[PDB]
Specification:
- The chain is mainly β.
- It folds into 3 domains: about 130 residues, Cupredoxins -  blue copper proteins (Immunoglobulin-like, Sandwich); about 180 residues, Cupredoxins -  blue copper proteins (Immunoglobulin-like), CATH 2.60.40; about 190 residues, Sandwich (Immunoglobulin-like).
- It has 5 helices and 31 strands.
- Strands 10-9-12-17-14-15 form a 6-stranded mixed beta sheet, with no helix packed on it.
- It starts with a strand and ends in a 7-residue tail after the last helix.
- Bound molecules: a molecule of 3 linked components (NAG-NAG-BMA), a molecule of 3 linked components (NAG-NAG-MAN), peroxide ion, copper (II) ion (CU) (4 copies) and sodium ion (NA) (2 copies).
- The site of a molecule of 3 linked components (NAG-NAG-BMA) has 8 residues, from strand 20 and strand 24.
- Belongs to the multicopper oxidase family.
- Its main location: secreted.
- Its EC number is 1.10.3.2.
- One of its GO terms (biological process) is lignin catabolic process.
Length: about 500
């Protein structure tokens, strides 16, 4: 794969991942965007060259590298109007950052409006040459990344504000829609007797997926970017922007087996081979599977996930047992989402630039009421109680700049302050749940916190966690190219956005 040093050229082109042709935003000619890779310790230099021509899908752009801490490079995190102004068509911008202390499965996507839905989204893997899970598998390479993407026949700005699911699920970029049931399916090849580390990446804009493979079980070894104690499952509900690594032991008879990714809404089930791909053992005929679904007897539950390496939960083991507890009260008015009575509206001056110019207190940062200032070196607890006032649940929330402990998961009344999973995207569940996370503020800068259903983010379901505002400017020296983005963007005609 490309990386750690690469050009990512953005253009508009016609694609037919499910046999239906539509115009899209592509990266180096393709959507999903190509796999980027490197290894622990690398300096990534990803030069984003914006050659977009289509205003309906936005000619401007910004790229976020999902899951990376970006310590001291907050300016490269990507969210438009939080960490930078968007890049303009005919221009380039170099994202230059290091990953000294993380490895795992990540992804990358546009972080401007709903542009990632129109195609700017792909996988990103940082390999660990001393991976502690490596004795569990034989093969871990570019052909073991499995992407899931909800694909729409109508563009994000042309269809409904809140689409009722997608036309197709794409698995490694290919899939069928109900009207294109002869379109080519993705094929994942295995050799009998080998063990594979599959890296499952949800590139979804909205629906979650229930993933399974006929005749096979899956051993989870990683959740988002965090290594887990090996957990055997036979079904995985994966929410938008989550990842899992699992080991597959290709010990079944030589045959074709259905891979299934059933969306929570949209075109559900498997009629005509929608929501499906093919696991093909080497030597099997090159035809569609005729395997049948079996009821899961070991579905993934988040509470069964624990970190491989002990990871201490911040604070003391009781509710509110931290320096700064916060409760996020969700609402919706039919058009806009709200957190604590505020719907995020992106500011003209990016939040990071406001802070560099001297705005360090929440009352002086805009948009007011959506920016929370957190003290440095402190324990934080955030609760996200599900509510009928925020439809479109379960909302999968994501915190930039951090992995966090999930002390209470969806569908569980337990609080685990001992060995809960840490991750970066968590389902907030349905009414009755009170999903709760903890983390420590060791990462100066403004970090977005939002629902990763992109239509909801765009309708304002977000806040900014401005951590350690007093050391933010010193900790994140910016390049001139970043300073230059706002004047370029602010000069554009409305028709060239
Ligand atoms: C979801 O979980 C959060 C966090 O536990 C809940 O917020 C917390 O709610 C309790 C009330 O049960 C608040 O405690 C109260 O504090 C006041 C003084 O401030 C005291 O007089 C009461 O005796 C009680 O101890 C707590 O402050 C509050 N935490 C935050 C950060 O707001 C939330 O209510 C839960 N939501 C649902 C729907 O379950
Ligand atoms: C710029 O990107 C746009 C979004 O992908 C793309 O929009 C496409 O616009 C046409 C209408 O001009 C839509 O086609 C329609 O017309 C057919 C009959 O030929 C009917 O089925 C419907 O009336 C339908 O609305 C496309 O649906 C729409 N594409 C998407 C994905 O929404 C523009 O075409 C792009 N501009 C250029 C110059 O390529
Ligand atoms: O990821 O936003
Ligand atoms: Cu993301
Ligand atoms: Cu992110
Ligand atoms: Cu949402
Ligand atoms: Cu984000
Ligand atoms: Na690479
Ligand atoms: Na990791």
């Amino acid at each position: 794969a490309i990386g750690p040093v690469a050009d990512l050229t953005l253009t508009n082109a016609a694609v037919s991942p499910d046999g239906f042709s539509r115009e899209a935003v592509v990266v180096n000619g393709v959507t999903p965007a190509p796999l980027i890779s490197g290894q622990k310790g690398d300096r990534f230099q990803l030069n984003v060259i914006d050659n977009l021509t289509n205003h309906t899908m936005l000619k401007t752009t910004s790229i976020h590298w999902h899951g990376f801490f970006q310590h001291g490079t907050n300016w490269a995190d990507g969210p438009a109007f939080v960490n930078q102004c968007p890049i303009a068509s005919g221009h380039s911008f170099l994202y230059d950052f290091q990953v000294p202390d993380q490895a795992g499965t990540f992804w990358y996507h546009s972080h401007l409006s709903t542009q990632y839905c129109d195609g700017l989204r792909g996988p990103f893997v940082v390999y660990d040459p001393n991976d502690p899970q490596a004795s569990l598998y034989d093969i871990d390479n570019d052909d073991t990344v499995i992407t899931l993407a909800d694909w729409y026949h109508v563009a994000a700005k042309l269809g409904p504000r809140f689409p009722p699911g997608s036309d197709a699920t794409l698995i490694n970029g290919l899939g069928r829609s109900p009207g294109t049931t002869a379109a080519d399916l993705a094929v994942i090849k295995v050799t009998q007797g080998k063990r594979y580390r599959f890296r499952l990446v949800s590139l979804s804009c909205d629906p979650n997926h229930t993933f399974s493979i006929d005749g096979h079980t899956m051993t989870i070894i990683e959740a988002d970017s965090v290594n887990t104690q090996p957990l055997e499952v036979d079904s995985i509900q994966i929410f938008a922007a989550q990842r899992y690594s699992f080991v597959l032991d290709a010990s079944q008879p030589v045959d074709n087996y259905w891979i299934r990714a059933n969306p929570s809404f949209g075109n559900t089930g498997f009629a005509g081979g929608i929501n499906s791909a093919i696991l093909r053992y080497l030597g099997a005929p090159e035809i569609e599977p005729t395997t049948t679904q079996t009821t899961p007897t070991k579905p993934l539950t988040e509470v069964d996930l624990h970190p491989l390496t002990p990871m201490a939960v911040p604070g003391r083991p009781e509710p509110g047992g931290v320096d700064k507890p916060l409760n996020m009260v969700f609402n919706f008015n039919g058009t806009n989402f709200f957190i604590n009575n505020h719907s995020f509206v992106p500011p003209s001056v990016p939040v990071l630039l406001q802070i560099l110019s001297g705005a360090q207190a929440a009352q002086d940062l805009v948009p007011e009421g959506s920016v929370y200032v957190l003290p440095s070196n402190s324990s934080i607890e955030i609760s996200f109680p599900a509510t009928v006032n925020a439809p479109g649940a379960p909302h999968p929330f994501h915190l930039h700049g951090h992995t966090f402990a999930v002390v209470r998961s969806a569908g569980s009344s337990e609080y685990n302050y001992d060995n809960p999973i840490f991750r970066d995207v968590v389902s907030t569940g349905t009414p009755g749940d009170n999903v709760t996370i903890r983390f420590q503020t060791a990462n100066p800068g403004p970090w977005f916190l939002h629902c990763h259903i992109d239509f909801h983010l765009d309708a304002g379901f977000a806040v900014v966690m401005a951590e350690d505002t007093p050391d933010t400017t010193a900790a994140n020296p910016v390049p001139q190219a970043w300073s230059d983005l706002c004047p370029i963007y602010d000069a554009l005609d409305p028709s060239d956005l």
